[PDB]
Structures are given as structure tokens and as C-alpha cells.
């Protein structure tokens, strides 16, 4: 699952064959002042020109001189085009106009500037006769500046020279090939036994990134083999040549998903580290070294450019999303697909053990026969499902059979990280009157009777029950069992039970898988809490009930709460283990707090993965005929929620003669929720408000 979800999220993010294709259908950097040369006589060359204006993160290419009068004999030129690469007041800008027809003897004068910067007049004076399209080597290997082709790399290429220099959207098939050739080839250095060689390796987990040697030491090793072949696909740039690239990733997902079926769970968290750090080699080192060797030296209408700035920033939020989705999808649904939720069968035995969950006794002086049907199976247990410490029973003051010289003092020192969950009576602590550590296999078979001679019951206005924990080694998980007898004064007993299965992982002395994601999720709760300060601290105040910053502030309050109950579970599990393994066959105390806190981390990362998919169908309005479906539903909703005000005024009164005459939210959610499933006419009044708006919205398009 870990090897498979990262294999598919990196393949679903090749829906940037849709975003880049829409950028493919197209293809203060220039002052708007008048340019005129009044120097060169008899040298009008009816030709084109090319501007050489490179600078601060901008490489503005040439021009294409379209002539109305075709730049006729003995003339000059003045115009304005839209340079899509913006350089400010940097000291590098030039021009180059060819020698067509006869040779030009023109000393090309200048080009005046008024809005060169943002309304700033820098006086340009070229005033020099040039060679055959020579340039201005002035302000504002012979040509050693070359090397500013820093976008002839796969690393951070959303930018190209215009209308030429191919593989615009083909360069996003050098990604899908490059990504999965590190995902496949790193899975082969991890366990792929074969028949390979001469002490190559057997298992090779070896402390994954807890010491910083091996899992980064393979990163600079598995890049060398794909670039022996993945540099051959920038040789096709002068078809089915493109098709073998999609074929190569098509086999590299099947080979990778076949080998990684049996990794130990430390060999999967290393496979992420040894592939993300191997990615980082070809981003930061190899592409930065590929940009040197290629072409060392061969000296041997106005609004459409604003549209693209929207489409960069839409593609930048897709690189954030399809990695933040991949962390949450790997946290909750990562481990709990084979271990966790394939085994509720662990829960299913103990319900059908204890002879059908003590058959729901609910009686005070019963369960003493049934105590000889929980102690008898679960003190010898010759079939399976071993013990893991002795059980007990707690009691909630009023100690009987006093003899209070030095005994009579069931302590149960209540020091614990919270209060245990509620029932019908109260919210019980840890600290009852814990006597009765039932043990030694036969006195526990005879302290069913010794708790009948000495009466230890019927005081302190309420009372209590037992707690048991156990685990099976086959699946790698545990179980925390609390049976509870409430003794109300009115009823005989209230009896309800709880079986909590969980995995006991604590630190692995420094690194695990949910220790990795719950630090990565902690980064996105710092990334978004800063991005909501660039709006709230400077850009606007009185931010009241606008559900942009009212709900992107909840996604910070839920991402940060996910990683602070997962590190709370991993830090509650080592302290509970260590005080257990001190006195190992001795006490009972341990694992109901880790279990209750682990499901509050699993059920809270699922609501995160909920919101991350509702956002994925909100992000579907970018097909224009389907964009009605969102707008007609965010427009009916302020009024269809208002229809449900009056349905509360009547539907409660629809219960105030139905459940009021039960003799002739607990009840109300079974009066509101359990009513709208059977009675169904009050479900179809919302049909009007949608088709009234859906026609008024379709009639607007």
C-alpha cells in the first residue's frame, strides 16, 4: 500500500497533460517611447531584428520584424510588442538586425525610453555601427556569459523561448519517466533477492535514516543507471519515439509494484527516503551539471499574457496538493490497510468469546457464575491468544471487613494522562479501590469464593468492574478490554463492554512510518498558517465570516491537530511500555489510554482525507459546461438551508404529537434523523429551488 499509493499519486499528477496542453495552445521589459534613427544614409536593410535582452531571472528572446511597408529603402522603424520576459534596470540589453540584400552601412542611432522601468527615463544611446547583427555589449570563452540557458533542464521548467525550441508538453513526459525510474530502481536495491552476487545483500534495512549513512548513500547510486538511458530522450528533439517513454513507465510501475509486495515496514519508509533523496540528486546536482556540457562553445491581445500568470499559479497549487494529499493518504490509509482494518476479526473473537459478551447480564449478584466463565478460559488458555500481564478488577469509599491497622487501604493512585470515558452514571478515573490482582492460576480460581466470604460490595453510591489486555502475534496488534458494571441505585446493573484493538508502536528508537508523516503534516500546518498571515495581517482586516479565511483556517486547525495526537500516541506508548517491561509479569496498569488515543488519531486523519477529496470535486468547475453545477449549488444553499428552519418548527411538532404520546440528541436525533429516512415527502421540496436556479443559471450562460 505504501509502495502502491506513491506509485499512483505520482501517476495521477500527469493530469498536467491537461494544464500544460492549454498553455501549449498559445506557444517593464520594453519602453513604449518612440525610436527613430536619423544617421545612416543609403543603408536601409529590409530585414528583421533580434533583441538580446537577458537579465534578472529573464531571458527575453528576439523579435520578428513584421513590415507594413516592409521597412523600405532609406527609412527607420518604431513599434511596440509584448515582451513576455521582464528585466528591470539590469545592465544587459541589446539588439541584432541581420544583413539581407546588400550589406548595411547604417550606424543605428538609438531607441529612446520613457517607461523603461515603471515610468523611468534612462537615456539609451547606441550610436555605433555594428557587424552583421552585432549587439550592444554595454550596460543600461569569449562570450563567457553563455550558460544562461538555465532552463534547458527538466529542473523547474515552466519557461521556454517562444514559438520554437520544441518539447513544451513533451517535457512533462520526461518527468513521469524520471520519477518512476527512481521509484522502480530503488525498489530493486531493496529486497529483490534474485540470484544476484557475491555479498550483494539479503535484507538490508539497517536503521532507515535514524543514522544518516545508508538511505541517503543509495540516493547518489541509483541515479547513475537511468541517466544512462533517460538522457537518450533529449536526443529525440532532432511520434512513437515519445511512445516508448510512456511504455517505459508502464513497465516500471508493474515491476516496482511486484517486488515491493513483501517489504518489512522499515524497508518501506527507507524506500521513500532513498527515492526522495535520489530525486534531489537529479534536481540539485545532475540537472545542474547537465546544463554545463550541452553547447559549451561553437567557436571551433494584450490580456492573454495575464491569463498565463493565472495558469502558473494554478499549476503551483497542484504541486502542493498532490504532495499534501500523498502525505495524508499515506498516514491514515498507509498502515491501516493490511494490519489495522483487515483485522476487526481480532474484535470479533472476544465478542463471541466471553460466551456472547456475557449475554448482557445487567444484574447485581449475577456474574459470579460468569466470573467462572471468564477466569476459567483466560488464566490457562491452552488454545491461543496469550496473556500479556495479569488482569484485575477495580471498585469505586467504604471498604468493608475493616481491620484497618495496616491494610484496608486499596490505593489505586490515580496519576494518569486523563479521565476515562463516561457511562450513564459518571466519568470514571483510573483510581478506584484496586484490590484483586487475580493471578497464580488457582487462587484466582479460589478468590471467586474469597470475594464471597468477605463482602467487598454495596457502598460508595456507585461501583466498578474489570480490565484486561492481550495480543496475538500473528497480526501485529494488541487489544484493550474493559468490561463495565455500573451499579445504579435503581436498576440491578448497567453492563456495557469495550474492546479496543490497536498497534503498539512507540519510537523504534528514533524513526518509524507514522513518525515520518506526522512531521510532514506538521510542516503544512506551518506553511498554511503563514499563508493566512499574508492575507490577514496586511492585506485585509474585518475578516468576518468570509468562508475563505474562515475555512482555510480550519484546515490549519485540523492538520495541526492530526500530528499532535499521533505524536501523543507515540509518546504515550513508550512510557507505558517501559513501566510495563520493568515489572513485566507483575501488574495490569497499562494499555487503555494508548488505545483510546490511537483511534482519535486514526479517525481524525480520515476527516482530513475527507476535506481533501471534497476540495477535489470543488476543483472540477474548470470545465465550462460543468461549472453550472457548482454555482447553482452555492447559490441555492443560503435559501435551502432557510427552508430547513421552518421544517424544524414543524417537524419537532411532528414529534410533539408522535413521541409525546409514546405512553399514549438522544430521542430527538432518533426523532429527526430516524424520520427523514422513511417519510419522504419532506425530502423533495428542495427540488424546486435547484431547477429554478439551474434554469436561471443555464439561461445566463
Amino acid at each position: 500500500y505504501i509502495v502502491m499509493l506513491t506509485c499512483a499519486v505520482c501517476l495521477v499528477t500527469y493530469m498536467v497533460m491537461a494544464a500544460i496542453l492549454h498553455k501549449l495552445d498559445q506557444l517593464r521589459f520594453k519602453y513604449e517611447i518612440l525610436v527613430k534613427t536619423g544617421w545612416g544614409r543609403g543603408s536601409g536593410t529590409t530585414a528583421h531584428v533580434g533583441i538580446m535582452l537577458y537579465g534578472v531571472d529573464s531571458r527575453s528572446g528576439h523579435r520578428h520584424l513584421d513590415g507594413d511597408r516592409a521597412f523600405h529603402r532609406n527609412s527607420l522603424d518604431i513599434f511596440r510588442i509584448a515582451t513576455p520576459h521582464s528585466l528591470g534596470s539590469v545592465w544587459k540589453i541589446r539588439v541584432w538586425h541581420d544583413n539581407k540584400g546588400l550589406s548595411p552601412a547604417w550606424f543605428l542611432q538609438h531607441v529612446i525610453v520613457r517607461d523603461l522601468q515603471t515610468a523611468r527615463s534612462a537615456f539609451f544611446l547606441v550610436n555605433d555601427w555594428l557587424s552583421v547583427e552585432t549587439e550592444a555589449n554595454g550596460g543600461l570563452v569569449a562570450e563567457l556569459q553563455r550558460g544562461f540557458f538555465d532552463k534547458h533542464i527538466w529542473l523547474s521548467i515552466w519557461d521556454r523561448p517562444p514559438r520554437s525550441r520544441f518539447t513544451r508538453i513533451q517535457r512533462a513526459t520526461c518527468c513521469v519517466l524520471l520519477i518512476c525510474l527512481f521509484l522502480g530502481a530503488n525498489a530493486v536495491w531493496y529486497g529483490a533477492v534474485g540470484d544476484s552476487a557475491y555479498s550483494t545483500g539479503h535484507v538490508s534495512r539497517l536503521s532507515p535514516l535514524s543514522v544518516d549513512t545508508v538511505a541517503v548513500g543509495l540516493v547518489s547510486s541509483v541515479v547513475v543507471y537511468p541517466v544512462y538511458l533517460a538522457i537518450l530522450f533529449l536526443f529525440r528533439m532532432s511520434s512513437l519515439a515519445h511512445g516508448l517513454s510512456l511504455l517505459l513507465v508502464a513497465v516500471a510501475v508493474a515491476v516496482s509494484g511486484w517486488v515491493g509486495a513483501s517489504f518489512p515496514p522499515g524497508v518501506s519508509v527507507a524506500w521513500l527516503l532513498s527515492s526522495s533523496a535520489s530525486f534531489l540528486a537529479s534536481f540539485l546536482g545532475w540537472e545542474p551539471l547537465k546544463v554545463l556540457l550541452e553547447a559549451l562553445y561553437f567557436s571551433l491581445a494584450k490580456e492573454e499574457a495575464r491569463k498565463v500568470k493565472r495558469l502558473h499559479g494554478m499549476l503551483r497549487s497542484l504541486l502542493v496538493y498532490m504532495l499534501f494529499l500523498l502525505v495524508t493518504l499515506l498516514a491514515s490509509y498507509g498502515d491501516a490497510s493490511c494490519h489495522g482494518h483487515a483485522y476487526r476479526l481480532q474484535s470479533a473473537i472476544k465478542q463471541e468469546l466471553h460466551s456472547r459478551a456475557f449475554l448482557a447480564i445487567t444484574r447485581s449478584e449475577e456474574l459470579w457464575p460468569w466470573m467462572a466463565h471468564v477466569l476459567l478460559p483466560y488464566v490457562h488458555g491452552n488454545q491461543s491468544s496469550p496473556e500479556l500481564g495479569p488482569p484485575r478488577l477495580r471498585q469505586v469509599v467504604g471498604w468493608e471487613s475493616p481491620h484497618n491497622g495496616s491494610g484496608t487501604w486499596a490505593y489505586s493512585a490515580p496519576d494518569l494522562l486523563g479521565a476515562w470515558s463516561w457511562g450513564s452514571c459518571a466519568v470514571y478515573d483510573s483510581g478506584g479501590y484496586v484490590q484483586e490482582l487475580g493471578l497464580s492460576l488457582e487462587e484466582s480460581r479460589d478468590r471467586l469464593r474469597f470475594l464471597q466470604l468477605h463482602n467487598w460490595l454495596d457502598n460508595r453510591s456507585r461501583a466498578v468492574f474489570l480490565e484486561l489486555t492481550r495480543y496475538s502475534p500473528a497480526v501485529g496488534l494488541h487489544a484493550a478490554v474493559t468490561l463495565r458494571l455500573e451499579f445504579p441505585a435503581a436498576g440491578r446493573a448497567l453492563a456495557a463492554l469495550s474492546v479496543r484493538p490497536f498497534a503498539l508502536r512507540r519510537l523504534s528508537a528514533g524513526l518509524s512510518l507514522p513518525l515520518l508523516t506526522s512531521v510532514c503534516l506538521l510542516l503544512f500546518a506551518v506553511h498554511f498558517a503563514v499563508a493566512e498571515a499574508r492575507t490577514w495581517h496586511r492585506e485585509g482586516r474585518w475578516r468576518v465570516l468570509r468562508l475563505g479565511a474562515w475555512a482555510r483556517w480550519l484546515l490549519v486547525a485540523l492538520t495541526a491537530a492530526t500530528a499532535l495526537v499521533r505524536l501523543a500516541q507515540l509518546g504515550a506508548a513508550d512510557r507505558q511500555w517501559t513501566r510495563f517491561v520493568r515489572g513485566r509479569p507483575r501488574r495490569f496498569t497499562s494499555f487503555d489510554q494508548v488505545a483510546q488515543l490511537s483511534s482519535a488519531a486514526r479517525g481524525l486523519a480520515a476527516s482530513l482525507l475527507f476535506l481533501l477529496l471534497v476540495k477535489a470535486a470543488q476543483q472540477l468547475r474548470f470545465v465550462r459546461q460543468w461549472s453550472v453545477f457548482g454555482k447553482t449549488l452555492c447559490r441555492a444553499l443560503p435559501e435551502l438551508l432557510g427552508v430547513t428552519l421552518g421544517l424544524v418548527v414543524l417537524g419537532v411538532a411532528y414529534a410533539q404529537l408522535a413521541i409525546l404520546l409514546v405512553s399514549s440528541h438522544l430521542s430527538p436525533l432518533l426523532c429527526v434523523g430516524l424520520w427523514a429516512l422513511r417519510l419522504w415527502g419532506a425530502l423533495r421540496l428542495g427540488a424546486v429551488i435547484l431547477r429554478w436556479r439551474y434554469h436561471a443559471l443555464r439561461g445566463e450562460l
Binding site: 484493538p501 470535486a617 453545477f629 449549488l633 434523523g673 429516512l677 423533495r684 439551474y694 434554469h695
Partner: protein, 168 residues
């Protein structure tokens, strides 16, 4: 039947009919989907009356818009199946696997669930699931499926009144 003729000689051994009875499942699954895809191609021919072409033009000009909302329906629908599987998946029989968490959502739409096990499995988030599922499915997501094929049928029929009252 070269297995049964080996057993009809020897009346004292074990007859291996397990490889023979597995392909009876596959023959009854394939020859029943095939019968289902024969009665659907009766729709290609039915198409006789004037009032039969109006009901085929309606369902065929709608399915572009109707498939577009059936994707937005399932993303909400497969996000409640994420929530119920992670919350109820250890206590309740009806939410045991993710394949069977989907099937029990369609049971809610028909009725069929008492949820006295649902509010017992979880006290707070149990009915927050149940009320906000019945709210969004029956007030929003069902009434939108109606509103698509209601405005489509009301636009086919007014188009043919510009075909009869313009060629009268």
C-alpha cells in the same frame, strides 16, 4: 467430460468435479450479462411514435450533463465511505470492509438501517454522520439529479413546438 468417464469405470475413488463446476459459475455469469445486453438493444428499434422519439431525444441529449454530475455525486459518496469505514469499521458488522461500506450507503437511501448500532458504536460523531448524510443526499444531491433531467425534458419539448408551430 473426460473426467466423469474416468470415474464411471471406478465406483470407489473420489470424483474431481471442482474444476468442472467452477466453469458453470462463469458460464452462468457470462450468459446472463449477454441476455441483459440483448434487451437493452431493443431500445435501438423501439422508436416508433412521435412520443417515443421525444423520450429518446431527452435521455440522449441529457447524458452529457448527467454524467458530469454523476462524478460529483460519487466524490461526496466515496468520501462518506472513507469516514464511516475509519470510524465504524471496528464496531459495526455493516461497515466491516470498504467494499461493504459502499453497499450499506445505498441501504440508507432505501431505508433498511436501524442505526441503533450506529449511535451505540460512537456517541457523538455517529449521528453527525447520519444526519448530514440524509441532509445532503435527500435535499441536495437527489434533487439535483431531478433538476438536470427536468430542464432537459422541458427544453426538448419546447424545441419541437418550434418545429410544429414553425412548419404549420
Amino acid at each position: 467430460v473426460e473426467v466423469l468417464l474416468q470415474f464411471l469405470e471406478d465406483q470407489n475413488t473420489f470424483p474431481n468435479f471442482e474444476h468442472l463446476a467452477y466453469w458453470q459459475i462463469q458460464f452462468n455469469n457470462i450468459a446472463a450479462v449477454t441476455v441483459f445486453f440483448v434487451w437493452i438493444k431493443l431500445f435501438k428499434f423501439i422508436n416508433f411514435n412521435r412520443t417515443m422519439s421525444q423520450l429518446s431525444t431527452t435521455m440522449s441529449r441529457c447524458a452529457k450533463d448527467l454524467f458530469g454530475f454523476a462524478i460529483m455525486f460519487f466524490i461526496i459518496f466515496l468520501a462518506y465511505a472513507q469516514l464511516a469505514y475509519l470510524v465504524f469499521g471496528t464496531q459495526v458488522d455493516d461497515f466491516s470492509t470498504f467494499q461493504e461500506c459502499i453497499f450499506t450507503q445505498f441501504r440508507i437511501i432505501l431505508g433498511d438501517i436501524n442505526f441503533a448500532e450506529i449511535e451505540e458504536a460512537n456517541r457523538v460523531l455517529g449521528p453527525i454522520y447520519f444526519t448530514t448524510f440524509v441532509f445532503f443526499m435527500f435535499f441536495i444531491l437527489l434533487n439535483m439529479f431531478l433538476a438536470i433531467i427536468n430542464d432537459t425534458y422541458s427544453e426538448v419539448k419546447s424545441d419541437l413546438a418550434q418545429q410544429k408551430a414553425e412548419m404549420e
